[PDB]
Structures are given as C-alpha cells and as structure tokens.
Amino acid sequence: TATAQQLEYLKNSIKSIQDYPKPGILFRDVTSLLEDPKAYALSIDLLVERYKNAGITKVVGTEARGFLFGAPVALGLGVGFVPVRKPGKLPRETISETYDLEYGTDQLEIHVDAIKPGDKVLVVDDLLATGGTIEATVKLIRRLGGEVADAAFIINLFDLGGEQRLEKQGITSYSLVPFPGH
Amino acid sequence: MTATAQQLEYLKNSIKSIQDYPKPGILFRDVTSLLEDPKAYALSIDLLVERYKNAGITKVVGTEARGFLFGAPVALGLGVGFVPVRKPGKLPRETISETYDLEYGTDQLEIHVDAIKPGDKVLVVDDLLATGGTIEATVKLIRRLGGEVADAAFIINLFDLGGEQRLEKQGITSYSLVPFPGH
Numbered sequence A: 001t002a003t004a005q006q007l008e009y010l011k012n013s014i015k016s017i018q019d020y021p022k023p024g025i026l027f028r029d030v031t032s033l034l035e036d037p038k039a040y041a042l043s044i045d046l047l048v049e050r051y052k053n054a055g056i057t058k059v060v061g062t063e064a065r066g067f068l069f070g071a072p073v074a075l076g077l078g079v080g081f082v083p084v085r086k087p088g089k090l091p092r093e094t095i096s097e098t099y100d101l102e103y104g105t106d107q108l109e110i111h112v113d114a115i116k117p118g119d120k121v122l123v124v125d126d127l128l129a130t131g132g133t134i135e136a137t138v139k140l141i142r143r144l145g146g147e148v149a150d151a152a153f154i155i156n157l158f159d160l161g162g163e164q165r166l167e168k169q170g171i172t173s174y175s176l177v178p179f180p181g182h
Numbered sequence B: 001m002t003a004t005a006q007q008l009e010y011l012k013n014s015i016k017s018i019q020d021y022p023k024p025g026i027l028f029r030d031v032t033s034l035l036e037d038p039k040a041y042a043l044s045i046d047l048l049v050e051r052y053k054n055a056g057i058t059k060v061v062g063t064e065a066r067g068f069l070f071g072a073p074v075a076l077g078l079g080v081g082f083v084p085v086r087k088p089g090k091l092p093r094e095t096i097s098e099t100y101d102l103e104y105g106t107d108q109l110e111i112h113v114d115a116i117k118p119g120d121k122v123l124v125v126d127d128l129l130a131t132g133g134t135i136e137a138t139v140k141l142i143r144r145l146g147g148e149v150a151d152a153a154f155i156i157n158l159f160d161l162g163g164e165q166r167l168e169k170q171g172i173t174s175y176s177l178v179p180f181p182g183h
C-alpha cells in the first residue's frame, strides 16, 4: 500500500480551480500531475503495484483522459490496452452503451473482438465523480463476456458517492487522491 | 540503437486495415490492434523512446485522443512531463488555440499557456501522419509559448499524403515506425 509521503506528493501535484466549469465547483485538474514527471511516474507505478498479482489480462480506458492512465498501466502490467471511445471513432465491429451527460446523453463504444470470455479486465480512469462512464464501460466489458471487478482512479470525489455506486455493480475502486466537494 | 527488420515487420503486421472506414474509398489503418498486443505496444514505445533518449527533450506533447496513447508512454520513457493538446473546452486553465483544416471546414487545438516555457525542447507524438495539419497547428502552439520543437514522432506514416515534406518546411523532422501506401 502506497506510503503517506507518496500519496501526499500526488495530492499536492493536482491544481484546483474555483468555479470551473461553473460556479460552486472546485475543479481538480489532473493536467498539473501529467506535467510533473515525478507525479505522473509515481501515479502509474502505484497502479501497476496494486494490480501486478491480480491476474489482469486487459486494461480498458475511456477516451480521452482514461487513455493517459490506462495505457501506461497496461504497459507496466505487460497486457493489452483496449480503448472505449466516443461513437464513430473505432473502425471495426463495436457494441455501444448509452449514458447520461450533464446536458443530454451519449454513447461509448468498444471493439467486439477486444474482450472475450476468460479476460480479467482492469478499468482505469483519471477521476471518479458520479461513476456513470465507468458503469457504462463495465456493461460493455461484461456484454463481451469479460470479467471486471476492479476500477482504478487517480482522483476520487468521495462526496459524490461513486465508490459505493460502483460497489453495488461488483466493482472495487482503488483511488490515489481523495478530494472533498462536488 | 537501430530498429531490427523483425521489429519493424512485427509492428507493421500488428496493424489491421479496414476498407471504407470512415468514408467509402479509404483503407483505414487501425492502431487499436497494435494497442491490444502487449508485445507490439511495448515495442512501439521502446523504439520511439530510443530515438530521443539523447536529444535533450524536456516536454512531450500528445494530440487528443489517439496521440495520447503514444505521447504519454514516450513522456514516461524519457522521464519528462506530458502536455496534452486538446479540442476546445477540455483544458481548464488559460489556453491558446490554433486552427487546422479537416476534410470539410476547420477545428481548433488548445494548449495550456503554462505548460511550455522558453528553454523547453519539445517532442510532438501522434499515432499517424496523414496531411500533418494537426501537427502544424501543435507546432504553432509550442512556438507561440517560446518552446523549441524540431521533432515529431509517429507510429504510422502515410507517405503518399506528403506530410513529412510539409513538416520539413516548418523545421520538423519526422520519425515513423510503420509506412503504409494510400490516402
């Protein structure tokens, strides 16, 4: 389990922006962690350590900030990376899941051939808020016969209840940086 | 210090081609089959990192979204910060913007103004070099912030679309792993 020093370094690497993207939200900006070679390397090293003995066979990350954390974790575990994408971007056969945006609905897609029965999948994302894109991604993985019990995040907004919501869907969340607020 | 024939052939054979995606008459070169093969993905990142490990790169810039899948592991391999360039309204801090042509009309790429400073030596990474319009726009962003950029790296080079020569005219040397013909 990560040391207190390591977890505090990561928390202090993330910039917060008052009243973005609207009034009353203190936005947690993971791009300041990406620009610090120490913070970014540590985040990936800590996620690789958590799952190295977990029998993961694929990492799935959602477009686009999910790519930044899922793909290095895949490389660190030595397993394939599978992108979940906005519609119309994947060129081979896909399945789709509909989920809620703040101002409407949208879809996520995955290649049908990218997950099979026998796969044990880790989902990786930058930040856990309501958890809606993760729940949609888990449905894509399970519809292809993949087993997914694990989701990893750089940031957890614990006041938004996403860890408990994902636990009701059989997903255990590992998060490096907890922050309060909406 | 040089890619073997066995390595370059493995990478080329790891990429699937899809006729008439996304519009009739394009043979789409799909890097997602390279991502799903841990051997191919790991190799591709090793080769890009090896080309720049002595070039004094201080930042890697990756274009949203497939660019992130190569630029960010290259940043980690070189032990330097990663800077995303994004479609508008995604980056939360102060940005500047550059316009580039799509097939029809135009779109914008943004960068955080604090991400690049005078003295930075930047590598741009993307999955695939086609016309190179996003890379020309990204180079303009970097130089407006006082960054030095002379290098772009790619997995795929569509050599029939002339992107390498266009980027050479802006002072950019391209490194690519997998050449394919066609548009």
Ligand SMILES: Nc1ncnc2[nH]cnc12
Binding pocket: A025, A026, A027, A028, A029, A127, A129, A157, A181, A182
């Ligand atoms: N405070 C916050 N920071 C980043 N993303 C968020 N999504 C919802 N609330 C957020």
Ligand SMILES: Nc1ncnc2[nH]cnc12
Binding pocket: B026, B027, B028, B029, B030, B128, B130, B158, B182, B183
């Ligand atoms: N054949 C191709 N495959 C992928 N992306 C492209 N962009 C332009 N032509 C392309």
Ligand SMILES: [Cl-]
Binding pocket: A063, A064, A065, A066
């Ligand atoms: Cl995103």
Ligand SMILES: [Cl-]
Binding pocket: A094, A095, A096, A097
């Ligand atoms: Cl479907």
Ligand SMILES: [Cl-]
Binding pocket: A139, A143
């Ligand atoms: Cl279902």
Ligand SMILES: [Cl-]
Binding pocket: B064, B065, B066, B067
């Ligand atoms: Cl993309």
Ligand SMILES: [Cl-]
Binding pocket: B180, B181
């Ligand atoms: Cl061909």
Ligand code: NA
Binding pocket: A023, A024
């Ligand atoms: Na309000």
Ligand code: NA
Binding pocket: B091, B092, B093, B094, B095
């Ligand atoms: Na803005």
